[PDB]
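Ligand-bound model needed. chloride ion.
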Amino acid sequence: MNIFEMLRIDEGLRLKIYKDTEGYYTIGIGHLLTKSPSLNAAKSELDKSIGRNTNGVITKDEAEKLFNQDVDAAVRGILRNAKLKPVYDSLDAVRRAALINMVFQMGETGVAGFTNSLRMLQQKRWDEAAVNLAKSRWYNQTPNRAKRVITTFRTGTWDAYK
Ligand SMILES: [Cl-]
Ligand SMILES: [Cl-]
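Prediction:
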């Protein structure tokens, strides 16, 4: 199991523009296109993102290409972030995957906002961090996915994904 397979499980793969859990236009493996309510605004961003007139539909390779860019950007965002970087450097390989997953889903800004949990992760207080992470809109809105990530941070294994 690695970050790619983990995120592929959490986000699924759709080749036609769809609406995410928040109602925003998305495509591929969790690639947010726009928060705008306009489907035309979405197709436009999609075409700009792929470099061709897609008419709202892409191939598997194109989805995979977006996904590789997105995980790359997630990692790089963590490393450039003053609040995140230290947490990431402190963690083992599996738990690093869990932090990357949160960032990919909610953005660097969003994650950087979990001040207390980040401090607990940094100190390796696993059970405490898991309890604090659950007190969030994130957990209440996407509980099954949050539970998986939380279990990953608590145990340091891929059990929730197996
Ligand atoms: Cl893009
Ligand atoms: Cl969920």
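The chain has nine helices and three strands.
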